[PDB]
Design a protein around this ligand. Structure first.
Ligand SMILES: Nc1nc2c(ncn2[C@H]2C[C@H](O)[C@@H](COP(=O)(O)OP(=O)(O)OP(=O)(O)O)O2)c(=O)[nH]1
Ligand SMILES: [Mg+2]
Length: 868
DNA sequence: TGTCGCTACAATCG
DNA sequence: CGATTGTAGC
């Protein structure tokens, strides 16, 4: 009678169906010898409200204090007589519950007795500010049914569920294979210690041609790859895809090439030529229904792909739109709007993975468009078809098949990127750690994950969680650096998980820090038991430590090593975001005093460590909120390591959980400013043999907002400065290289690609005020004017500052590279680069170096020394 | 409909 | 000078 299934996504419609949540997942059907998508409707999720009684009765209007003691009997009588009649609530179940509370609502005791009241989700919702003669507050009035279910049944991310006495639906309500109705949340349980089942992953790439008549994007191809047994706890399979399907349509006026049919048949692929976009969309929807993918992946799926798909479905009136998801509906959610919430609801029951968001979360790249990710992750080159060539492709079989195969290659690259970053396993792991829904986790962001983590933690410890909400304080301390060049050994000491460690050691928690509704609250007494937040953050830190230790295993596959590094960084960021969300104004758990206390203790710790190291008769030259740089004044590495161990032990002696470890040994250092230095990190090889690896932090060479020519010049200069060559030879080599680069720029022998400057966007190009014209925004608008996919917020734009004869400011002469390659009146501003891209960077680098100055750099580049 | 924290340098505009 | 926008660093 039981019903065991693995739930992946949950969908709730607060308005359409009240108190009903649909869970989509996998169920093993023995006859089919495979898992099949199943949908479970958990109905009758009653809404719970906790009432906090007063100590004495109070007149509602007079604001008096009668003095009659208030017991739960009076609270129940009041709710039965006044509130129930006033708000039209017919049936409700009331019980007395002892619950704890430590959050930001004044006059709420730490522990007290509450009157938990439950009634049907169809009944009206009580106001958030409800008060009465017998109670001073009502909680959980606006709690979502999904949240109530998840916290009541202690479901934490995807996992196996056991359903008791399931019933069958009168008529189908989902596009899945198996359906079941649960009449009460009590019938759903969690079963642990079982492997996740393989899921279906469908990677789709589409090619569209815009109609300038109506500025609407029409789809002309959809190449999709599917794998039916993609694991969620193992390595990605090779090849990542099992089968595929391609659909190719024609425009409104154009016609197919002469022998398109014969060439397509000879191609031997699952190509379906759809006469009209209506048929193409119908075929795609039928294919999605047949495959029933659980994880649909793509690039810009949330911003471009799904929005275009739904818009064209609406325009062409393709009947069964809801097949894009897993529920049966009739009215499509309104498109547009911020985020992909409309798209997510349209694809309800299917986990949408946007490798753009995932890549932004996991790795750092100069640009996040598909070509850059392909070049960086897969080390492959992607061929991009201009939209004009897509329009002109419908004139010969060869070009049309090339376009379709390019769409296929884009889909394959998307799947390869998803597998390489290990996005799905990481999403599953983080969702299990946090306890929220997987789709939200893959949507990006750290606030919701931490919010659900703390919801689960506090709920399990008999706490009333706060209702969902309907440079403020000082931060880390950066020591003043001793700018210069150090050719001896610099020893870097860095704390491990400094803020998590502070929270653990000093017992900083909602239940221990006595706040008051900008003064730093006092530290909690050492007698108190560990709070909820220290426990959760300790678990996170321990998981990260386990991953790091697993990384140290010798003879590890480099790809597996990089995956472990990404996982460790993700766990570090999860703990740090747990810290940060204390200082988030819109967060559910805003506890600014706690964040201020954490940062204040961090500053105190750094100051104390600096004082200790200085008291050891050692030189301290830098430090950023958890670290110290020490000038050992030694040339032997063994002594450096011995001193590092000694000082680390001495510092650690003063703490219970905080630990200081040797971050790295720099053979040479070039400390320029705060958060700006270059070093030759030393990684010993064995038997006294060490290998030196360069390391730049914060310099302009490691910023996407500088031309690659400037980056190359600065890298060469830094390499020379950090080398062991005599100083005179270093200066001579710098002069020679600068002269060569000046000659190359003057003679136009530099590649054009080296002139690009990359700047991202924060708002849409339209939303930028008329603050003159920031270069990138300028080019951004041009890109939108032309007939191509638009550039939205958070999109990198590469522009080249070029001469146009305008006698205008450089910032107002920014142009796209294609513009330069096309127009005959635009030329690269050689002087601009030699004077404001190469000279500034090298001049900043060579400030602490004797023999090089701004005038000399200007002279060597062929420029005029006067102005500089 | 969501949206982690703060410190610091840098180029540009008013 | 101060304000903005952007990109690093913890
Ligand atoms: N809120 C927030 N705080 C951060 C972030 N990055 C660093 N911090 C803060 C909190 C960290 O405890 C502190 C020290 O920076 P680190 O980069 O050295 O990280 P941490 O020491 O926590 O760990 P680790 O050195 O990798 O063992 O800086 C972040 O992304 N968000
Ligand atoms: Mg650290």
């Amino acid at each position: 009678q039981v019903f065991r299934f693995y739930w992946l996504d949950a969908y709730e419609d607060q308005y359409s169906q009240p108190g009903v949540v649909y869970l989509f997942g996998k169920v093993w059907i023995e006859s089919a010898d495979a898992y099949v998508s199943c949908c479970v409707s958990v109905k009758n999720i009653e809404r719970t409200v906790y009432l906090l009684p007063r100590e004495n009765r109070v007149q509602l209007s007079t604001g008096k204090d009668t003095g009659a003691p208030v017991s739960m009997m009076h609270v129940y009588q009041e709710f039965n007589e006044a509130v129930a009649e006033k708000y039209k609530i017919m049936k409700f179940k009331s019980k007395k519950v002892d619950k704890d509370y430590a959050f930001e609502i004044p006059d709420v005791p730490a522990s007290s007795e509450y009157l938990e009241v439950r009634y049907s989700a169809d009944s009206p919702q009580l106001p958030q500010d409800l008060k009465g003669e017998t109670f001073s507050h009502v909680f959980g009035t606006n709690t979502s049914s999904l949240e109530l279910f998840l916290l009541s049944r202690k479901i934490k991310g995807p996992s196996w569920l056991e359903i008791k006495s399931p019933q069958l639906s009168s008529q189908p309500m989902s596009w899945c294979k198996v359906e079941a109705v649960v009449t009460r949340p009590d019938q759903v349980s969690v079963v642990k210690d079982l492997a996740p089942p393989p899921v279906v992953v469908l990677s789709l790439s589409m090619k569209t041609v815009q109609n300038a008549k109506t500025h609407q994007n029409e789809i002309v191809a959809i190449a999709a790859l599917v794998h039916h047994t993609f694991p969620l706890d193992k390595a990605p399979p090779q090849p990542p895809f099992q089968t595929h399907f391609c659909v190719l349509s024609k425009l409104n006026d154009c016609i197919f090439p002469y022998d398109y049919n014969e060439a397509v048949k000879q191609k031997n692929a699952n190509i379906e030529i759809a006469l009209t976009e209506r048929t193409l969309l119908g075929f795609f929807l039928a294919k999605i229904h047949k495959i029933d993918p659980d994880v649909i992946v793509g690039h810009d799926i949330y911003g471009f792909d799904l929005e275009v798909l739904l818009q064209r479905i609406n325009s062409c009136k393709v009947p069964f739109w809801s097949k894009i998801g897993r529920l049966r509906r009739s009215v499509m959610p309104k498109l547009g709007g911020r985020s992909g919430f409309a798209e997510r609801n349209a694809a309800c029951g299917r986990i949408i993975c946007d490798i753009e968001i995932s890549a932004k979360e996991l790795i750092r790249c100069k640009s996040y468009h598909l070509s850059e990710l392909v070049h960086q992750i897969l080390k492959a080159e992607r061929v991009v078809i201009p939209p004009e060539n897509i329009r002109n492709a419908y004139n010969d079989s060869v070009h049309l098949l090339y376009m379709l195969e390019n769409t296929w290659i884009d889909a394959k690259f998307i799947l390869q990127i998803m597998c390489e970053l290990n996005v799905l396993p990481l999403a599953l792991q983080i969702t299990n750690i946090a306890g929220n829904v997987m789709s939200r986790t893959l949507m990006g962001g750290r606030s919701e994950r931490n919010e659900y983590l703390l919801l689960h933690a506090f709920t399990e410890n008999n706490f009333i969680v706060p209702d969902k909400p309907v440079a403020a304080y000082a931060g880390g301390l950066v020591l003043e650096p001793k700018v210069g060049f150090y050719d001896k050994f610099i020893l870097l000491l860095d704390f491990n998980s400094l803020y998590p460690s502070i929270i653990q050691e000093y017992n900083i928690c909602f239940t221990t820090v006595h706040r008051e509704a900008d003064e730093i609250p006092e530290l909690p007494h050492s007698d108190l038991e560990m709070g909820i937040l220290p426990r959760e953050i300790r678990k996170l830190v321990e998981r990260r430590r386990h991953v790091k230790q697993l990384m140290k295993q010798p003879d590890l596959n480099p790809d597996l090593y990089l995956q472990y590094d990404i996982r460790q960084k993700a766990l570090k960021l999860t703990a740090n975001s747990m810290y940060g969300c204390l200082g988030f104004s819109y967060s559910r758990f805003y506890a600014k005093p706690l964040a201020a206390l954490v940062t204040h203790q961090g500053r105190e710790i750094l100051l104390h460590t600096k004082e200790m190291v200085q008291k050891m008769n050692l030189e301290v030259i830098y430090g950023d909120t958890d670290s110290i740089m020490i000038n050992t004044n030694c040339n032997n590495l063994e002594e450096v390591f011995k001193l590092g161990n000694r000082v680390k032990s001495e510092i650690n002696k003063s703490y219970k959980l905080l630990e200081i470890d040797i971050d790295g040994i720099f053979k040479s250092l070039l400390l320029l400013k705060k958060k700006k230095y270059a070093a030759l990190t030393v990684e010993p090889t064995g038997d006294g043999k060490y290998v030196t690896k360069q390391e730049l932090k914060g310099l302009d060479i490691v910023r996407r907002d500088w031309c690659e020519l400037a980056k190359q010049a600065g890298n060469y200069v830094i390499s020379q400065i950090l080398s062991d060559q005599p100083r005179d030879s270093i200066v001579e080599n710098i002069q020679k290289k600068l002269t060569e680069i000046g000659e190359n720029v003057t003679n136009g022998t530099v590649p054009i690609t080296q002139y690009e400057i990359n700047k991202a966007l924060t708002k849409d190009p339209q939303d930028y005020p008329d603050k003159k014209s920031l270069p990138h925004v300028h080019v951004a608008l041009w890109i939108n004017s032309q007939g191509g996919r638009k550039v939205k917020a958070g999109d990198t734009i590469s522009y080249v500052i070029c001469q146009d004869g305008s006698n205008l400011s450089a910032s107002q002469r920014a142009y796209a590279q294609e513009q330069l390659q096309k127009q005959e009146n635009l030329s690269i501003d050689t002087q601009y680069y030699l004077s404001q891209q190469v000279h500034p960077v090298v001049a900043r680098i060579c400030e602490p170096i004797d023999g090089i100055d701004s005038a000399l750099i200007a002279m060597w580049l062929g420029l005029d020394p006067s102005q500089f």
